[PDB]
């Protein structure tokens, strides 16, 4: 049972008629289908042609603007181009692929039209009403190529459009749902529209099959537009292509990995608080490997003795960790007070505050960014 809103261009075709329909959809959805588009056939022919014609230029290179041709695993090739209106920007890699150019111009007029509708639909500011126009925009044309498993990603633009509603999965709002509508184009909204909706609209990540020769066009206002759009694009491209990111943005990449490590230890701390309190209800402090399975269950991942010791790095007085007579690590809450607990009554706030400054210390430093919290060394 299709649960994706479908906009039929045969019925409603005009902007005054379309605008309320779009707005009604965007209040509950981030994804919708487009039925009976005029150039759907031309579009499907061009996509068909790509199987034998106009192959990805493998000698083109893939630069720091995340454009060009990029060989991926399992004989899949990525081709990508980014265009921006702003003369101050240097995205000069021109698309020489005649099929992709033809596909682009059809997806462009279409995408731009519905992009303006989306902004007028759920964004209040009048300054942002004209941000995207025929004279102000940024596009990302992406092509996957298969010689003959899913990639999750969260688009960051206003609107991203697929010329073929196939081999794509979405989350309806708990589990991914496949989309197979060969006569439809697929539309999905990005994080920019949601943020600018100030609550009205929310979006969600997509899954695509990289082996299914998927093409897509994403629309932005000019990348220099302040909400730092470029920062979100960069972070998204880095998440998508970590190997390229290692080459051109190794610091940005390492910082991103560190952020996950911070999220890890913070959640680990609160989970440790819960587990230790429940156990303390019964003299002798509990051994750590006894508590680990329960800790792992709440963390929904494998947690070893080394992970617990990461907390002591962030805050050495958080727990009393010692070796018992049986040479096992015992852990318990501190009995006595220090300067910290005499002036800050919250243990969680104490930790999270000291975790943020530790993180800030690492990224401020003039040293190679470590991507994890080192484990604290306990003496014997």
From Swiss-Prot:
GO MF entry, a single one: DNA replication origin binding
GO (cellular component) term, any one: cytoplasm
Keyword Cell division annotated: yes
Biological process per Gene Ontology, one example term: double-strand break repair via break-induced replication
Domain of life per record: Eukaryota
Keywords: Cell cycle, Cell division, Cytoplasm, DNA-binding, Mitosis, Nucleus
UniProt keyword Kinase, yes or no: no
Compartments where found: Cytoplasm; Nucleus
Miscellaneous comment text of the record: Present with 2190 molecules/cell in log phase SD medium.
Family designation: Belongs to the Cdt1 family.
The protein's assembly and partners: Associates with the MCM2-7 complex. Interacts with MCM2, ORC1, ORC2 and ORC6.
Task performed by this protein: DNA replication licensing factor, required for pre-replication complex assembly. Faithful duplication of the genetic material requires 'once per cell cycle' DNA replication initiation and elongation. Central to this control is the tightly regulated formation of prereplicative complexes (preRCs) at future origins of DNA replication. Required for the recruitment of the MCM2-7 helicase complex to the replication origins.
Protein name: Cell division cycle protein CDT1
Organism (species): Saccharomyces cerevisiae (strain ATCC 204508 / S288c)
Organism placement in taxonomy: Eukaryota, Fungi, Dikarya, Ascomycota, Saccharomycotina
